[PDB]
Amino acid sequence: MRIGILYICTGKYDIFWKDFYLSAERYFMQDQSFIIEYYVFTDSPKLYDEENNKHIHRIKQKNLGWPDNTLKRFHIFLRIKEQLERETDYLFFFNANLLFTSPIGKEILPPSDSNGLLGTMHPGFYNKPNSEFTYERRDASTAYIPEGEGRYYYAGGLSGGCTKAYLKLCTTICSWVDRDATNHIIPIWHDQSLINKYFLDNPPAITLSPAYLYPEGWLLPFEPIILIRDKNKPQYGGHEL
Numbered sequence: 001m002r003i004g005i006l007y008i009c010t011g012k013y014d015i016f017w018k019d020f021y022l023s024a025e026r027y028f029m030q031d032q033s034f035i036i037e038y039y040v041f042t043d044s045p046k047l048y049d050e051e052n053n054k055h056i057h058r059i060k061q062k063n064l065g066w067p068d069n070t071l072k073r074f075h076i077f078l079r080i081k082e083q084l085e086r087e088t089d090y091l092f093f094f095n096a097n098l099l100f101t102s103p104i105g106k107e108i109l110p111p112s113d114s115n116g117l118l119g120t121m122h123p124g125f126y127n128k129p130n131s132e133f134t135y136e137r138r139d140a141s142t143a144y145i146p147e148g149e150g151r152y153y154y155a156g157g158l159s160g161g162c163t164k165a166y167l168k169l170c171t172t173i174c175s176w177v178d179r180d181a182t183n184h185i186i187p188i189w190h191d192q193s194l195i196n197k198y199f200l201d202n203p204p205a206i207t208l209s210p211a212y213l214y215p216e217g218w219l220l221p222f223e224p225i226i227l228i229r230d231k232n233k234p235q236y237g238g239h240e241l
């Protein structure tokens, strides 16, 4: 089947796209059943390595800067809503600085009988209890959730599921941020604080171990599968804006 993979890279984050694109081929979508379709949102005219592979689709999108670039990601997925219904069956989002290390496959695709959602544990909060989750604790916010509840702390570096179930997600949170905008609030950990609520209302069919979000340099009780490139390396410099 045809699986769609969402990817955002604006400003200088187009430096991350390449090693990701190559790694995606080596490891993602290996066995013939599956065909990969890149949906890239960039300011830039040119994306590596284009021309050559049809599937990859460059989608024009300007720079909104921090924090709007991760806050309004879901409005970015809806500019092309109708397109995602005819050309895709499953959806996924990968962080710009992600990288593949070990093969992937059908193990991450939600069963069709379930809700059809996917989340991933956060690498820093997988060994911690509810007391330490960094949700949003302001009542007037749509991302408000108090103490003693919430099962996990999901990260926004990876999320997906069936196209239907994921678009409804995209459409849901789009209102939630917009509603906050009229209430004059910006959530603390905007991509996540919003998402964690949604995964609280409707917990994903799958929760992926932080092996799929492996920070570089770290020592975890896991085998690397998908990796997080370290931004404070002198090649990247923390700062892109």
Ligand SMILES: CC(=O)N[C@H]1[C@@H](OP(=O)(O)OP(=O)(O)OC[C@H]2O[C@@H](n3ccc(=O)[nH]c3=O)[C@H](O)[C@@H]2O)O[C@H](CO)[C@H](O)[C@@H]1O
Binding pocket: 007, 008, 009, 010, 011, 012, 013, 065, 069, 070, 094, 095, 096, 097, 122, 155, 156, 157, 189, 190, 191, 192
């Ligand atoms: C996994 C995690 O807990 N990390 C945080 C953050 O990672 P970091 O704060 O470590 O990285 P970041 O916020 O610079 O990256 C945000 C991601 O959004 C996209 N992008 C692209 C171009 C651009 O100009 N700005 C931009 O934000 C891009 O794919 C990038 O990977 O981002 C995650 C992805 O949502 C979450 O939101 C969290 O806030």
